[PDB]
Design a protein around this nucleic acid. Structure first.
Lengths: 138, 55, 27, 97, 225
RNA sequence: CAGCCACCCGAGAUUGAGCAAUAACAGGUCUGUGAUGCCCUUAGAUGUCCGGGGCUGCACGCGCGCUACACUGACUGGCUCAGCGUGUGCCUACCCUACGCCGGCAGGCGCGGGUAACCCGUUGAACCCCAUUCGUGAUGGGGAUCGGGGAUUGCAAUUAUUCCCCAUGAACGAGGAAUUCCCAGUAAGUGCGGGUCAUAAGCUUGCGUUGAUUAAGUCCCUGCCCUUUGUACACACCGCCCGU
RNA sequence: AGGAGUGGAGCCUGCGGCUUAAUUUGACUCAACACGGGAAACCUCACCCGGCCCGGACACGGACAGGAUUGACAGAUUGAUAGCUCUUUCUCGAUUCCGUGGGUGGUGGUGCAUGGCCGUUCUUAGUUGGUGGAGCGAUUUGUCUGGUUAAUUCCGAUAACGA
């Protein structure tokens, strides 16, 4: 049983399976704070202290994430967690608390529950990159 | 009849072993998906094989 | 209509035979 | 150089059965798997092709490294006369044209 | 056979290309238009669209038999499974190859290039095509080669609508002084639920239904049907 | 007015490509073929063929790109991931290979999984870490690290385009002229997959992988287009033309 | 306004030539110079060196059935299977000897004879009828002074209107 909420950034995508619990947060065999980078750690911690530990104390959400790159796997765990919390609150308890948390998250970061649409652009022949071109002599 | 002078060096590991299936061309051969085509002939019969220029 | 003469004229408006074709079309 | 008469008779009969025979000009293959077991090399195909080209009893068409002969009525007549075959020999099947 | 489907499909395409080229160098002199291949259990049927069905069928039903044999040696298909059906075309003046070969034989039959192009233009508009172009290039006069165009009607050159609203036939024509090139491009007309045009209109064309001419009522009334 | 700019809102307020007119160029392609208009006919007519070397070697100038320009770099790397997509073949063992055996090593053995969202593959590289080791060299920032140990169920690795092992070294302190190419997942930072391919990527063609102070402008340069204007040019300034 | 290559170091395709057995077959710029998908060990280069041939259809026409041997075994090869002319011995033969040519074909040259294809002008925003207006006419207007647009894209002006 999941809140069916998902969350993406770049080709990466994360979903928070949700159940009734006491706010224990886990990410693919690990909790939310033992993630390897230890410098992107603040990016993962953004929600849990952006709105407080109390709101993350009555719901158990396990965030499964599949995608490329370290940082692109981030911005998916955090957004999935925040949007899963907002959807859980919206569909189960009420909207007033849900509306409050949504306003808080949007004010801190408007792209906290909306996906980042940008994707890597294709490459065109006669150049290595999307917009870079091969050097030639005049 | 020319069997005691040819076949003096087996030809199964070089560009002579692969030839264009239309004009016997050994230059610019496409071997992807077993096409065995050259660029000119491939673009000549590109729409017939099934490939279409859309990307 | 003599489409032969007109078409030969459009092939070469200033050709070696242009005067003959122009004269043929006149009438 | 000594193009066999037996191989010629077999080739002529094979052509007469259906109307075409497996013709290639590649020399890297000595005998085609269909052309094997009967001593039929590349030069035999070449000689038959050129002899029928000069004869004109079949019309030649080349396409995608392959040859095709148009067996004509004159071709059937000359084949019978030179092979001395019975007169009731003719490819005349009707089923599933 | 067991085979990865990618290789299956590309080999099938090579098979279709082989058929098309063999018949174009083979069946052209018989008003060749095109070929449609149907796949049935353990057999492939080859329906031939061609304006001259009597020529391809031939006397005694000879040639249409022989072809089935001539491919059989090359393709290596099972016996009995291969058969072909010679049909008259359902697209007489709207199949580019038909009038391309027509022009080929006009130029071969001692008919002037400009006159032949004008005649096929007339025929194509008589069929009802919204436009046609015949780009003929070569040494039409002297040794300085040149191009020569006959554009009439209208014609789209760009975008996806070109693929299905335009029939394009590029052919090489024999000449005494060299090889001429012919490009016959026909813009197919539009008809809905028909057999002569695509079922969808030009995407840049908007058609508006004329509204009804009902008189506006001036007093409410009760109508008993 | 056509429209432009800024914003609550909204996934998105300009995604990127494909196609792409009239006319033309003496642009390239006869190295794609009875698709081609001329020479080769008298034993070299190529329709069969090559044992061997050629563009891999040179006083040289040039063009694309890579490895370096530092202590934002390195000296077991210990732990965490995706993306495009290719792969069992009849012209031919000529594939991707999972797992155990042989060795620090290229490679061989077996059972095979995969004709494929069925197996490689949950495609465990680039990276972020470190309560031990580099320290301003010409060198562990580096390559002919000169020469010897290697080899593929397939004609012989010869200035050997394949290769796992063992110090030295040329050179470089941001590269005086002249300047490519760059509008947001863009430049740059790297690896992977095809075309290459019997093994063969500094090339090329796609792919994710990190995310920018920079620009919302202009005709200063280089061009190109248009308008007006002049023309004795029209083969059109590579024009025309005058005189000795 | 900034991010990089060089007359800054080793490697990859093409020119002035290979007097050896040898590139000649593209470019004095964008629009040649990691391009012909060109990373040829030999095979693809015939290019360059005895590079087996009759395997130069012609029944041309004629003597003759031997018209003949494209085989390997030796001073019949100082290059394994090169019998690429040395009277050997061929053991198994009806193919043939040859000039009137796009013929058993030629990666031999004409691309300033060609076609197809592609490149380039040009991915710019340009191009053209019909009817009307002007001019004897070639032609011109429409297709524009402006604003707008990525764009003759639209607005607007307007002897043009509608495409």
């Amino acid at each position: 049983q999941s809140v069916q909420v998902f969350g993406r950034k770049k080709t990466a995508t994360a979903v928070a399976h949700c159940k009734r619990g006491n706010g224990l947060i886990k990410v693919n065999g690990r909790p939310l704070e033992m993630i390897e980078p230890r410098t992107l750690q603040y990016k993962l911690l953004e929600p849990v202290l952006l709105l407080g530990k109390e709101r993350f104390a009555g719901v158990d959400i396990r965030v499964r994430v599949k995608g490329g790159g370290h940082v692109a796997q981030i911005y998916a765990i955090r957004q999935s967690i925040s949007k899963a919390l907002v959807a859980y609150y919206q569909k189960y308890v009420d909207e007033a608390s849900k509306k409050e948390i949504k306003d808080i998250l949007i004010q801190y970061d408007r792209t906290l529950l909306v996906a980042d649409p940008r994707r890597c652009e294709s490459k065109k022949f006669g150049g290595p990159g999307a917009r870079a071109r091969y050097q030639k002599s005049y | 009849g020319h069997q005691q002078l040819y076949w003096s060096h087996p030809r199964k590991f070089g560009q002579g072993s692969r030839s264009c299936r239309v004009c016997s061309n050994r230059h610019g051969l496409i071997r992807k998906y077993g096409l065995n085509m050259c660029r000119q002939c491939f673009r000549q019969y590109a729409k017939d094989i099934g490939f279409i220029k859309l990307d | 209509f003599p489409y032969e003469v007109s078409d030969a004229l459009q092939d070469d408006p200033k050709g070696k035979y242009s005067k003959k074709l122009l004269n043929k079309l006149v009438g | 150089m000594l193009m066999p008469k037996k191989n010629r008779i077999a080739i002529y009969e094979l052509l007469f059965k259906e109307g075409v025979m497996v013709a290639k000009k590649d020399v890297h293959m000595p005998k085609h798997p269909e052309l094997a077991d009967k001593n039929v090399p590349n030069l035999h195909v070449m000689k038959a092709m050129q002899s029928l080209k000069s004869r004109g009893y079949v019309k030649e068409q080349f396409a995608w490294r392959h040859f095709y002969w148009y067996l004509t009525n004159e071709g059937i007549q000359y084949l019978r006369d030179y092979l001395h075959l019975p007169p009731e020999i003719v490819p005349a099947t009707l089923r599933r044209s | 056979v067991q085979i990865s489907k990618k290789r299956k499909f590309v080999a099938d395409g090579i098979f279709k290309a082989e058929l098309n080229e063999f018949l174009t160098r083979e069946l052209a002199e018989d008003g060749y238009s095109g070929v449609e291949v149907r796949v049935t259990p353990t057999r492939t049927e080859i329906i031939i669209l061609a304006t001259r069905t009597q020529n391809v069928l031939g006397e005694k039903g000879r040639r249409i038999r022989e072809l089935t044999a001539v491919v059989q040696k090359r393709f290596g298909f099972p016996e009995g499974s291969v058969e072909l059906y010679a049909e008259k075309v359902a697209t007489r003046g709207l199949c580019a190859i038909a009038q391309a070969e027509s022009l080929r034989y006009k130029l071969l039959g001692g008919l002037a290039v400009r006159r032949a192009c004008y005649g096929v233009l007339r025929f194509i508009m008589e069929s009802g095509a919204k436009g046609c172009e015949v780009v003929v290039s070569g040494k039409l006069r002297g040794q300085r080669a040149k191009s020569m165009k006959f554009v009439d009607g209208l014609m789209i050159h760009s975008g996806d609508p070109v693929n299905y609203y335009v029939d394009t036939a590029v052919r090489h024509v024999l000449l005494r002084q060299g090889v001429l090139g012919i490009k016959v491009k026909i813009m197919l007309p539009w008809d809905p639920t028909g057999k002569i045009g695509p079922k969808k209109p030009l995407p840049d064309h908007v058609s508006i239904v004329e509204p009804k001419d009902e008189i506006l009522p001036t007093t409410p009334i009760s109508e008993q049907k």
